[PDB]
Structure formats: structure tokens, C-alpha cells
Amino acid sequence: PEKDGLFCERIFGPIKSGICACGNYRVIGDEKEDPKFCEQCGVEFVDSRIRRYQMGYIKLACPVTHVWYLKRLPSYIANFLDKPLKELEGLVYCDFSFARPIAKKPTFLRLRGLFEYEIQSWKYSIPLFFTTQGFDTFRNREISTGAGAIREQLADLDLRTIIDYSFAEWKELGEEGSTGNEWEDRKVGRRKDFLVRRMELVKHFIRTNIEPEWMVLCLLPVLPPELRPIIQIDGGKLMSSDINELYRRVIYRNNTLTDLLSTSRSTPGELVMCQEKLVQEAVDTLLDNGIRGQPMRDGHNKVYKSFSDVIEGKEGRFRETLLGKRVDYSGRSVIVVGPSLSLHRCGLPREIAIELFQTFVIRGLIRQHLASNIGVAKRKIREKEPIVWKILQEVMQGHPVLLNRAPTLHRLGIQAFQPILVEGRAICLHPLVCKGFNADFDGDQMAVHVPLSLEAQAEARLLMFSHMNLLSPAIGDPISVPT
Amino acid sequence: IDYRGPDFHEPTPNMLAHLKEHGKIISREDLEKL
Amino acid sequence: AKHVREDYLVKKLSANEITELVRGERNVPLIIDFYATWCGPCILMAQELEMLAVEYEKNAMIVKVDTDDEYEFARDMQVRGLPTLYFISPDPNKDAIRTEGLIPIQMMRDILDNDM
Amino acid sequence: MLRDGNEGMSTIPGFNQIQFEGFWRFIDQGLTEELSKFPKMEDTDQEIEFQLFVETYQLAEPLIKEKDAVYESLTYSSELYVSAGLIWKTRREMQEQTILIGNIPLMNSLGTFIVNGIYRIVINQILQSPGIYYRSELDHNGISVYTGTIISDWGGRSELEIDRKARIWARVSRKQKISILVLSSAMGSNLREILDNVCYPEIFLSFLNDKEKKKIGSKENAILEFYQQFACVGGDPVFSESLCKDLQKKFFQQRCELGRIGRRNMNRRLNLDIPENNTFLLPRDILAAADHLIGMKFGMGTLDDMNHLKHKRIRSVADLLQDQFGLALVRLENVVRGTISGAIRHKLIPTPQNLVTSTPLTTTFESFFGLHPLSQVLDRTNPLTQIVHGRKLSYLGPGGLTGRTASFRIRDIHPSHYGRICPIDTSEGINVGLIGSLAIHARIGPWGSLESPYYEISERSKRVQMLYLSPSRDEYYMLASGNSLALNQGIQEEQVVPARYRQEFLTIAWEQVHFRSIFSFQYFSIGASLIPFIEHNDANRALMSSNMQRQAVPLSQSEKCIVGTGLERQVALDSGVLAIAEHEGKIIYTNTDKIVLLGNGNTVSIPLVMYQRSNKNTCMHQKPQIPRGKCVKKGQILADGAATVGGELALGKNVLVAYMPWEGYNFEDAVLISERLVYEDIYTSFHIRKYEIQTYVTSQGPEKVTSEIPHLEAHLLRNLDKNGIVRLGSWVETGDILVGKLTPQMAKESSYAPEDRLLRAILGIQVSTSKETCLKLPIGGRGRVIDVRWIQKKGGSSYNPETIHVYISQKREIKVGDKVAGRHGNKGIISRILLRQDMPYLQDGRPVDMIFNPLGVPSRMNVGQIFECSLGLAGSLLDRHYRIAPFDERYEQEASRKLVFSELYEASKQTANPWVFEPEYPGKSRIFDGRTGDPFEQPVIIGNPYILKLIHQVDDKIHGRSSGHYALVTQQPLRGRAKQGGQRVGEMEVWALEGFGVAHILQEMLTYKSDHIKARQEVLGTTIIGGTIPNPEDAPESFRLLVRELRSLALELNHFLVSERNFQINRMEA
């Protein structure tokens, strides 16, 4: 990558365990006396796990309003300022406004105004009335534009006074009869609800450790590099992440903002506003894309996978990554019928069993002194020695396995069983439990799982065996009857 | 199964060979270029 | 046109062409087939003649006449039934042969080999 | 052009005419009609000019051959040459020469294209045809919305609506631009005197007699009233050239190009009179549309159906190739524009070929065959699937409906897909009713409409009484499907037969019948017409009866079916697997690599296909048929193929079968075969797997190939040749190296793990700089190497990455877990294999070869198997084969019963076997027990059905994983079987584990066997050695990732462990 970049090793950890930026390696292996930084490298030699946990951080040279709190349904900013959504939406983004922040500083400038910039005449109308004494000593004192005025206003109003004023407004509204006109019928209710949610939000703000100014963020965190990697394929193929693309766009436009602002000197006009609001829109796209009017698309006529897109969705986060987890000690198969099996017994193929109880067989070989080392035991396993099956017929007796039908429908779709070794490639299943699994034999697949913990084995043996689950929980009718 | 017969369609022609007109050999194509 | 081979080898000739063929000099046995489209058993005769025309590549000439087109000519040739074949010797000394009905192909081979 | 017209009207047409006719039509006309659209582009300096003469194009014979095209992964194509010069307006010259525009792929005898060594086929599509469609979708208030939608060739909708005699408006899109006026962009007489053409032009006549002002040029001048430019603007719109061109699509270009089909549909629905060459929107068209819309409410009128086939059109290979050629020509003209821009500033006089390169056509066609969803790899599981794939129709694809936004009415059988689309062959799953097949006799007629043959009944006897009817002409005739075998005391012409008038099913006298369908194979597809006694099977089971014939495995040696429908012969003919003679003559030479024929002077050599690989890993083994010296006519069979014994398709074998519950081993849908099917090779097939390994050019070196690998077991290199690739004949097992290339590893002693350094130092293992890179055989996949291929690269690059292909065949028998299926939807899983002395035997001592479960017949309701069963027996005892057309119950009543019972009695009488036809329970007999010598108390139905072997084999479904690869981010087992993944548990599964009240089991399926970086290693350690497994403390890495991307949105997520004994916060670090 590069220093001060998306994969900047200087801020994150080393890309290799022990190898620094230059390339030297230090043996640590312990949490003991060792140089934390390698002088010129300044990089620790601990494992690259810190790569996936280090957080990046960028500074936008303009306050940025969070998308969730401004663009979504009844934005909390509108209730906080007691202002229409169109007004604040014109303060930023569209930029067709000029807000007035009432704050600590006195207001020797006559009157306040709220905002007015949408008329083509204002290009050369106000300059005759505006400035007239310097530029920064009038324009930069107050009347700010963009998200800065919004954030300053957020940092100005007193919550307790807001509560008192909204309570007074509620009392004033409640003492009016009306009930004569449909428009008047429905006008009071919306305003009263507005006031009630306003005091609710304000009271929540008062007694919490959260400040309102934080909804208009100024510093953007950056997701760790390893969690958004670029796949290294043979021949030089790279499968990067779109997150890198939006991040690169955002930081490049922020760099352009810093270049323009630090080179103020001959101060320009609408160009600074245009570029600053372009940066704001870029951050908006990065945070929550697909929620704005125009969703940006990459070089395939396809919208990017936004952070909200990752968070929200049946295939993104909070839905299957934290719930649907592939597990070890598992294997698919095909199901056949065995009428000779007892109710507390199933049948596992010889190929499946050796790939699930491999480690217990490694026990059996090492302990019984028929093998010496892990590599020797695995080599003996890989050559299908006749003593291997004696071990994988000896560690499986008494170790339950959970059989699971892939299209699970009811509670009895997963059941524990005592496996035995059968010859073939199919799992033999008891016929009575078939209706418990709702399983026919026209071709179906069953997944096996092995409980490793002693507590888990106790659970499987003493709670999920098909001899203490003979009744369905619907009405209490038998579930295993002669079919 | 005896093809041709009364209940089978006419034989399917080779598609390259069927293109009698809109197709020329390499030699004639080379000749007509000069 | 030399690019795709013909599906059918037997060539349909008019009455005058058949008269010219029989009158003119010949060096190979001649086969004259009488047939019609509405005919029932004539499909099998057409198939058998098509098969026979392949084994005898250039040693025989096989032609057919459609009685729906040339009816009087077929009547003049003493045809009293549709599945009719005429075998013509390559020499004018030997007389012709008329066969009626759906005769087997092997007897046709015997006819134009051992008798023509 | 037209071939013999009586094709499909006197014989079943070949199952190739769709693709073949489409490609021939494309080559004949689309090239001409697309080359003419090429412009006369030139330079703005008035100095150069480019011309493309149209009536000079021709194609060239392909350089490579199809065998070499698939042999070197090339693209079988022909070069397109067009004669056209370049004009220079500098000395007023024109250099005329023939140029090479590019390359166009060609179809083979199978109807497919060979692109990059891959067989690909083009799937037909069904799209709503251009025209006018009236609709009404009601309202929540109870308001009728009379919509007058108009569809152009591209899809431009300009609706018209009335709301209780309201103002007719051209709704453009969404709810905007509600325009009322019908002004002309030329001549529209908006005033009067032409609008008063049907009943009345008032309908709120310009409100206050003008609504603003009057005709002049526009109803406010400035073109198209004030809505000349009202599409989108940042504020107020003002007329501009770019805006005018953009809105021309919405006004005239993309919303008034009806095309041929659109003009025909508009002239039909509105019953107008305009010359058919006029394919644009006329004022009279909109006037008549508005008249019909207003008159619909006033009594008379009718609403259109969105599903009727007369309102749909078919796109085939011809139209797709024409559109691709148009795109390629547009790209080409852009390229020549750029070149001519660059051909002046460099001061060079080039020959016309230097202004045109074959970049656009070639790349365009490769992108088309590689990315378009309507071009799919050919399925070559068996000869049936090759034919089935070509004849498909789909509503999906570009410009069509999808599997998510498709309504439920579009997924139903309209009473118009009768002679055109099969009603019992579709695709299961989400896209049900959106992908279907074609009827056997169906044919794409003019204007992309499906046509079906029908016999016309008339008292004139014209000449050819059969016609090809289209859906528009189908519903206005009375199509009988009955018989003339009924006589009453009156006259025969008053007898009643079922018919089909409009979209109903009546019963009418014979005297009012206009047409009469006579074909049995007219309402079904290829898959559904291979089922004997289909009329005795429930229509629910026909879908899977057809779908389980496309999964058949071509066995080693083939065998013909005793009972069939007679369509197998044409399927075999048209599959392309056969080798049919293209010339007459005698077979003068035959070897099992070639057949040499001599006929009409020249001598023709036909090379056979000995052993090859299919797209689904199956062999294709041909075999000569006629011996030396015999003669063949044109088109007759010369060589057999895979699963094509004789001239017939043969996907299975005939086996003795008895329906009885043996011991519960045939529970549900389990089958109980005998050992006789595994030692006589009754079900034995060859599967060839293709392992491909390539090389790359890294920084250190280009991954040198070698026959030796440092510190690799020599036993694993026993079969490795001196060059570095295993030679033929080696019985390679699992884990054996096929191709091993010493990829140059970095001299990264610093990056090497301390455990590796300890292993190499303590035990003296040498330190090498080469990665262990080889094509190790995966689990399974054993076999004997039958072919090896080694190739390199040859192009601009000086380095040649070598790719190696290894073909490993495997003779797989039939074992427990395989799937054997019949032709009537009776599937099965082999459960047990018994010795021949342990199976029931008939009263002649012959052991049974297969035992089915009788209970499966009343459930699926497929009695048609039983008939076949019994009939098969007769064939096996009489040396005769039956080819029975479906629906034989028209001649008689219970005709199949008569046929089966008469054949059984004849077989029992000719060969003295009185158990074949017991005259007290016909078709059944009393079989004995193979392990007691006792007769089963009730008679059992026995027979000789045709059983197939399916492709879903058990060895392709086994799994097992203790540990291994984990995903880079989620740190979970990867996926499936190729990546050695682990089975997934989620949602419902967890709900079961919570239901049982098991917490440790659920906990350890999310922490230990999943995300935990530090806990998988420790369970591996405490499981290699033995201890008490300790419960984890830290959350899995899933929660860490969750808090990570909730930090990226400026949000916190903090865990806490407030103690119950000290109230001290114990905030975890995350």
C-alpha cells in the first residue's frame, strides 16, 4: 500500500507477523522485554490481528451532517431546531440559504434574518449592501452557510428553555376549542405531536452523556483494512472492495478542500461553496447510499454497497452473519432407510465418520502408543490402515451426533443419535422418526454435527434423543406412530 | 431405424455445405483481392 | 450443384424422353417405373427403387413415369395396374420384361442380372 | 425463401428448424438490412469521405476447423468481406478495395456456436408485441380507469384515459405532464372538420371555446403548445437543441416507431386502412384510439388480455444476432470516426483497410456470447438434453419480466398455448411458468407468431387441406377433436363431438366444425412425448416425469426400450450424436477410428468419436453400424452414439420388476436392486473429469515446471513423468500429484513461522525458496488417466504460461445411494443390494431384478407405469417391441387394457407359461419367497419396465470436515464441497435448539466451531491431547466485526459486566 493511505501500515499493524515496514524481523513470541517500536520502522512485531482491529480516521475540513439524523423520516434535527425540514435542507446540500447562528457573541449587526438565497438578483444586489468594511470582519463574524451554521445552532439553544417554551406552546394549543374545520381539526394534532416529541428528545438529551453537536460530525472514522481487503489472485488479479472506492473518493475530495482552503489568499466565491458541498455529498454517499435522490454508480451501472446496505438487508449484517454460521465437524450425505436400526441409533458412512472424529482417532492412536507424533498419526490415518477403523469404532461408541434435515420445518427437525459405522456412502435412518423429520427417500440430504464439550454431549444425550420426545408440542399427540 | 422413409423429414444439410452462395474458398478470396 | 448431393437418384422423365431413350442406342439395362402419388403401395416401390439405384452406380439407368401426367402413354405400354416396372435390354434382339405388383428387390436384381 | 412447404404438415419436423432457420434468415437478410443502416460518415473539413457499398458483401470459408476450434479453445467463425473504397477530397480520388470488417461465428449441425472452445446456444424469448392495449384496473374509491396504452417497438408508452367522460390525456410517466391536446407536429387540423370523424369532437371543447387560443401552428404556438420542452430542468425550461433531441424520443423517435408488428396490430385492433409500409404514428391512429376509448364506456367494447399469444412475439437467434451486428456496426463507425479524425493530423494516405480494424465485431460477439443471459452453455448430459435445450422459450432476459416482479396470472396456462407451447413442461422453483418448451408441431411463422397445424374441413377438396393457424386466427374457428365413429338412426352429420370455440370447451354437431386437429404429438413437447401411456398418468406427475429424463446417465452399453412412444427415433436423428451419411455409395472401409465410403467417384472419410468428455462429465462413444461392402442412401445412419443403440434413443435398461413391500427396505421411495445389476454391468457408466492447472509469471520466476519437488514424498511422485506431468495409464489415487510446478517462493526466512524454523533446525530439514504448488487430486476423483494436454501462449507477450489438462476417467458401478428413476415419475434411492438367491422368483425360477413399493402408485396416481410393466413382460417373452402413440382410447373404450391383456395372453399361449396371464387376476401372478420357498399370499404384479440411472450420484454428495481453510473476513468454513466448507446452521435450526432447551450445544456452534480466532486453536490443542473443554469468555469475531462497522458510522457499542457482589463496572474491550 503506502504511507498515509487506505492500507497505511504506519497507522495500522504490520502486514506480516514480525516483519516491519522496512523488512526486518524481531523474535518476540511473548509479552516480555522487547522493543515496542523498531526505531526507524516504528512498527510492533505482534501478530497481524491488529490489522483487522485498528481504526482509521480522517478530518473533513467542513462539518458533516450524519445522513441518518437529517435525511430519514422525521429527522431529529428539524425537531431540535423547531424548523421546517425544507429550511435546513436548503441550508446545506442544495445550499440555497444563508443561516444566522444566534450564539454567545453579541449581535451589533442590525437584526438577525434567518436565510434567503434563491434569487438570481442576489449575485450583485447584496454586495452593495453587504461587506462595505472588509471581508472577514463582516462575513465570517456570523451568517454562516453549510453545515457549520447548523452545528453552531445545535451548540447554542438551551435545552431547559426549549422544554419550558414547548410546554407553554402545548398549554396554549390545549386551551383552544376549534373542532369546526377539517383543516383546523388536523392542524392542531400534528403540531401537538411535534411539541411532544420535541420535549421527549430534549429531556432525553438533558439527562444523558450525549451532546447534540455530535449529530453534525466533523471527524470520519475509517473501517479497518483487513475487513475490507483486496483479494490477491495469481497473475495479478485484484478483487478489491467498493468501500475502498468511496473512501478514496472522499479523502481525495477532502484533500482538494484542504488545498483550496489553505490557499485562501485571493478568496473566491461560489467555487469554495461548490467544492465543500461536493465533499459533503461524497460523505453522504459513503455513509448511506441509495437513500438520496441520486445514487452513485460504479463502472458497471451498479450502485455501491453502502455502509447502510451492509447493515440493513436479509443478506447483510444483523441477519445471517451473526446467526447463520458454518461450523466444523459437519458433513452432508444422502439418506436411506434402515428398518433394522433401533430407535436410539443411526448409521454413519465410513468416509464421513473419519472426517468428523479424526481428532478423537488421533487421541486413540497416540494414547494407545500405536503412534508417536501428530504427523505420524495423520500419516497413518491418510493411508487407511486396518487399525484406524478399530479406533473409529471405539471413540464413537457413546458419543452422540446431531442429525439435522436441511429444510428444517419444526422442532423435531434436529435430533441426537448414537451413530454406528455402516458400509456404503449413505446414512441409514430409522423409519419411525422419518415423519418426525418429514423425510422421504426419493433423494434427500442430512447434515451431521458433533458436540465436543462434555456439557454439550450431556445435553445431546439427555435432552434430544427420540425416546423422551415422543409427543408433539402442538396438542400432545404421538409423533412416532406406525406409518 | 431406417431413416428417409415416409414418416421422416428430409435429411438435414450440413450448414457450411448448405451455404452454396454466401461462401467462398480461401483461394478464390485471395485471387479476387488482387 | 456439386456442393450438396442429391437426395433422390431416380430422375423423372416425360413420355417423349422415354421414347428417345428406348429408340436410341443403349449399352446398359433400362428400368422404367410407373407410379402415381395417390398410389398406396407405390411408396414402398419408390423406396426399393431408390435403394436399387445406389448399388448399380453406373451399370444401369433407372427412370420413372408419372401416370397422372402421361396417362395415354402408360395405357399404350399395356399397363393394367400402378406398381409396374419395365426392364429394357441394352440390345434390340432381346425383348422387354413387364413386372406387376410389389416385387421384392432381390427378384429385381435377379431380373436385371440373369435375364438382362 | 421456403423449403418443401409440407414439413410439419405431413411429418414431424426436425427439432432444429428454429435455430437453423433463424441463422439462415439472419445470414440472408439481416446482414443486408444492417449494412444499409451504416451511415456515410466523414470529416467536418470537407476533405475525406467513407463509403460502404452494400450489395457486395460475402463471407469467407473458416480457416480453422470445428474439431480444432474446440481443440485449441478457439472460436469457429467466418470472416466478413465487404468491397468498399475510401474517397479523398484532396485530389478527388477514390481508392476501391475489399476490406475485412471482422469475424462472425457460425453454427454447426447441432444448432450451436463454438465460442472459445465452448458450445453455446441461444434461447428464444417472448415479448409483448407493439400495438394498442386497453385496460381497466379499478380504484379504491370505486372508479373505472379506462387506460389506452400504446407500446412501440422499443417500449414507449403514451397512455390515454377517461374518468366519467373526462379529458383524454397522454400520460407520459409517473404523475406529470397531464397533456390534453392532440396537436400536430405538422398537420393536425386541431380546429375542426377532421376531428368530427366518429361520433362527436366536443368532449369539453377547448373549455371556453379556446382553452387558451386556437390552432395556428400550435395551441399557443412555440411548437406543441407550451409543453414543447417539459421533461426535466433545474428551474424553468427553455427550448434548446439538446433538450429537443432528448425529448424527440418521448415525442416521435422512441414512441412512434411501431414497426411492422406494431402497424399490423394497430390496423387490426382499430380496424383502420393505412398502407402496411407506414410504421409511424398518424393522427388518425390516435383519433381512432380516443374514439374507441370513449365508446368503451358507452356500451359496446371489450378489454384486451395481457397473456393472449396474439399479443406476444418471439425473438430468436436471427433477431438477437441482428441487434448484436447493429451494435457492432455502431462501434465500428465510431472507430472509423476516431481514425479519420487521426488520419489527417498525421499526414498519411492509408488504404481503406487501415481505417477499419476487426476490434468491434469480434469483441462485440465475444461479449454477447459471454455475458448475455440468453446465450447459455450447451447441456450434453445425453442426446435428449441437446435437443431439449434448443427449443426453449422464456419471459426473462433483457426487456422482459423477471422472477420477482411477475404476477400470478402470467404463471398460468392461457387457452392459447395449446398448439404452440407445451402445458406440462416448465421450470420448477421461483421462475415457474416463465420458462417453457415448444410444441412438437409448433413453428415460428411470420411476425414472430407461433403457428400450429390443423386439418381444414370443407366440401371442395382444395389440394392441401392442412393449414398453419396463428393464435389470432385460432379462437374464431371451431376446432373439433372427436371422431366420426358414431352412427344414429338419423344422419351421421348431427353427431356430437367436443370442440374448442373462443376460449371454452363446447360439444357440437359435426356440421359446424371448421378445423380438426389430427395429431397426437401436437399439444406436448419432446420430454412429455417420451412417456408411454401418458393418458393414464396424473398431469401433476408429468412435470417430474419429463424432468427426470434429462438427468439420465448414458451407460457403457445401451439397450432399446420394449415399450415406447415412437418419438425416440426422431430424437436420436436430430440430437446430432449420430453420424449420418452425407453421400451415397458403399462402405468400403471401416475401422474403429474412421469409416471410408466410395460413391459417385470421390471417396469420403468420416472420423468417429472414440472417447470424449461432456459438459456434465460423461463419455460420448460412437460405434459403426453397417459392415463392409453394403450400401447406404443419403441421410441414412452410419454410426451409433452414446445411449443411441440402433436408430433410437436409449437412456435406460429393461429390468424385471415386482411391486411388493419386501422388508421395509423399500419404504417411501426406496428401491431394492439385486447383485445381478452390478456384475453384468447393467448399470455401469464412464465419467471423465477434467483437471486444468495453469502457470503464471511472478516476480521471482514464471513458475518453472519440474518432475521433482524438494522434500516431497517420492511415493506421491511415482507416476510423475520426467517432464513433470503424469503419463497415461497411472491409477492415480486421492492426494496424488498430477502436475507439480515449483512456484518460486520468496527467500523469506524472516516471514517463516518460528515453528517452521524449529522443525527445520532441530530435525535438519533444509530451507527452500519454492512453494509447494501442485495439482493434488481431491477427495474422490480416483481413476485412470486417459488423456493429457500441455499448451502454452503465443501472442504479443514473450512469456508463455503453460496450461495442462488431465482427463481422469472412472468406471462407476451402481451402489447404495444412487438414484434410479422410471419414465412415469417413479423415482427411487437404492437401499440394499441382495444376492440372487435372496430375492423372490417367479414360477419359472427367474429371480426378480428390482422391487418397488406398491403404495407409491395410489399416492402419485400414475397408473400408466403398471400397463407398461405388464406390456414389457409380453415383449420379453415374444421378441417384439411396441411403439404406441399416446391416447389410444379414441378407437375404443379401454383400448390399452385390450392391448395389454391380448399381448399377455398371446405370450402365455405361444410360450407355454400359464403364469403370464392368470385368468382370475390378469397381469398378476403368485411369486415365491427367495429365502423360505413359500408363496406370498397374494398375487403380485410383475413386469419388464424401462428403468434409467440418474446423474445425482452419492459420491458427488458426501462431505466431511474436521478443520481447514477459513474465510479471510468472517473466519468461517468457506463453502460446499469444492472449498471443504462446513454445514450452515441458522434461523430455524437455532429455534429448534432453543426449543429443546440446550444452551451449551447452541453456544458451541457459534463460538468454538465458527469465528473464534483464539478458541479454535485451543480446542484443537485440548482435543489432540485431552482435557475438560473450557467455556469461552470473549465474544466471537462476529460481534467484533459488528462493533467495527458500527464504529464506522460514528456509533458506540459497549459491553458491561456490572458485578452482583461489588457493583464494579467491568467493561469489556471491543
Side-chain angles (χ1 to χ4, degrees), chain A residues 16-17 19 23 25 27 49 52-53 55 66 68-69 217 220-224 226-227 229 231 234-235 247 287 307-308 310-311 317-340 349 351-352 354-360 362-363 366 374 379 383-384 402 404-406 408 410-412 414-415 425-426 431 434 439-443 445 447-456 459-460 463-464 469 483, chain D residues 663-670 696 703 713 715 734 749-752 754 757 779-780 815-817 819 827-831 954-955 957-964 966 968-977 981-990 992-993 995-1001 1004-1011 1013-1014 1016 1019-1020 1022-1029 1031 1036-1042 1044-1051:
Chain A
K16 189 71 178 181
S17 187
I19 284 180
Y25 155 69
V27 189
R49 299 146 174 259
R52 75 211 278 121
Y53 300 145
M55 281 285 318
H66 210 310
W68 281 0
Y69 305 114
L217 71 98
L220 200 40
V222 152
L223 197 170
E226 180 151 272
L227 308 184
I231 294 298
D234 301 325
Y247 269 147
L287 280 191
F307 265 110
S308 294
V310 184
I311 271 180
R317 298 299 198 247
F318 267 137
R319 263 302 316 261
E320 91 292 334
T321 312
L322 296 100
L323 302 179
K325 291 191 197 175
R326 335 266 299 175
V327 307
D328 304 358
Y329 305 88
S330 82
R332 218 158 256 286
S333 59
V334 84
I335 325 174
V336 299
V337 52
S340 51
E351 179 148 316
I352 287 188
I354 200 48
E355 312 277 347
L356 298 198
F357 298 78
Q358 189 169 31
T359 57
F360 297 85
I362 290 185
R363 203 82 42 91
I366 283 169
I374 287 187
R379 173 180 276 257
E383 308 276 31
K384 319 213 198 316
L402 310 190
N404 168 354
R405 190 146 181 284
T408 307
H410 43 287
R411 156 190 158 130
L412 291 197
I414 316 170
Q415 289 200 84
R425 269 187 160 70
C434 287
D440 59 345
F441 297 103
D442 72 328
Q445 313 214 80
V448 199
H449 307 274
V450 200
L452 314 149
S453 314
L454 209 59
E455 274 97 13
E459 307 294 9
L463 285 178
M464 335 184 48
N469 297 324
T483 319
Chain D
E663 279 286 342
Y665 281 99
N666 50 24
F667 208 58
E668 321 285 330
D669 322 67
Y696 305 84
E703 299 173 357
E713 167 64 31
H715 184 60
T734 170
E749 278 174 28
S750 73
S751 81
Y752 281 150
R757 259 96 58 103
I779 278 178
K815 48 205 181 298
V816 168
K819 299 178 91 33
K827 219 212 264 186
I829 285 282
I830 289 112
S831 152
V954 57
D955 50 17
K957 291 171 180 335
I958 219 159
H959 216 312
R961 169 211 227 277
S962 300
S963 179
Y966 297 106
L968 273 89
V969 189
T970 51
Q971 204 75 226
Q972 317 239 354
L974 268 307
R975 212 171 185 90
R977 311 188 165 76
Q983 304 324 116
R984 188 195 161 194
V985 294
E987 302 295 315
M988 280 138 187
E989 267 95 39
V990 176
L993 294 178
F996 278 112
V998 283
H1000 299 80
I1001 291 181
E1004 84 174 356
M1005 302 206 159
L1006 324 167
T1007 88
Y1008 264 7
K1009 307 178 257 184
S1010 295
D1011 299 321
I1013 292 285
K1014 68 160 307 203
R1016 299 188 318 271
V1019 47
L1020 253 72
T1022 197
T1023 286
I1024 287 314
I1025 85 180
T1028 48
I1029 272 162
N1031 295 5
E1037 311 286 89
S1038 61
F1039 175 58
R1040 308 254 273 279
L1041 262 83
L1042 184 75
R1044 286 312 143 170
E1045 61 275 337
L1046 277 73
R1047 283 184 174 187
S1048 280
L1049 256 71
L1051 304 181

Side-chain angles (χ1 to χ4, degrees), chain D residues 621-838:
Chain D
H621 170 216
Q622 287 200 18
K623 178 205 296 211
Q625 202 71 29
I626 278 174
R628 201 94 40 104
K630 283 204 204 128
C631 329
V632 290
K633 309 196 286 182
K634 186 174 189 295
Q636 284 191 7
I637 175 183
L638 280 183
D640 263 7
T644 324
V645 59
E648 280 207 337
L649 184 66
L651 307 170
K653 297 231 179 195
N654 309 287
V655 280
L656 197 68
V657 153
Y659 287 72
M660 54 164 330
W662 195 70
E663 279 286 342
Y665 281 99
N666 50 24
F667 208 58
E668 321 285 330
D669 322 67
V671 195
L672 203 162
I673 80 165
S674 95
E675 196 106 327
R676 200 199 77 86
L677 302 191
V678 305
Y679 62 71
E680 298 218 10
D681 293 328
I682 304 305
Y683 294 110
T684 284
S685 84
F686 312 135
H687 272 60
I688 293 106
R689 297 214 49 141
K690 169 177 182 183
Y691 301 105
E692 152 187 341
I693 177 168
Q694 313 208 9
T695 66
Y696 305 84
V697 191
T698 55
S699 50
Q700 302 275 97
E703 299 173 357
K704 61 186 310 169
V705 290
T706 168
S707 160
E708 77 268 27
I709 300 201
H711 291 197
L712 209 52
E713 167 64 31
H715 184 60
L716 265 70
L717 281 87
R718 62 195 219 281
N719 317 123
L720 210 29
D721 204 34
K722 50 98 188 161
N723 190 19
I725 319 165
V726 176
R727 218 212 172 280
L728 318 180
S730 298
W731 181 249
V732 301
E733 285 257 330
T734 170
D736 197 321
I737 284 93
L738 308 182
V739 186
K741 48 169 194 47
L742 266 192
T743 296
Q745 204 181 14
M746 311 315 88
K748 43 185 191 186
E749 278 174 28
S750 73
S751 81
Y752 281 150
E755 283 87 356
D756 284 356
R757 259 96 58 103
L758 259 68
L759 188 74
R760 284 164 196 176
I762 296 162
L763 312 191
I765 295 179
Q766 227 270 331
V767 171
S768 156
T769 67
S770 45
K771 189 78 198 305
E772 170 71 11
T773 36
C774 44
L775 187 50
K776 299 177 182 180
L777 221 39
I779 278 178
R782 325 149 62 257
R784 168 157 279 108
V785 196
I786 66 145
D787 198 2
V788 58
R789 183 161 201 100
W790 146 56
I791 212 168
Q792 65 271 20
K793 252 173 49 163
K794 275 181 62 177
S797 74
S798 172
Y799 292 148
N800 304 346
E802 282 100 345
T803 76
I804 324 294
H805 305 313
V806 202
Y807 297 109
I808 315 287
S809 82
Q810 170 180 5
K811 190 192 77 53
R812 30 180 61 208
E813 307 96 311
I814 169 162
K815 48 205 181 298
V816 168
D818 293 302
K819 299 178 91 33
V820 283
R823 270 179 309 188
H824 310 268
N826 44 352
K827 219 212 264 186
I829 285 282
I830 289 112
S831 152
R832 209 180 170 186
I833 296 199
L834 289 189
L835 316 167
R836 62 184 189 157
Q837 61 254 35
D838 275 331

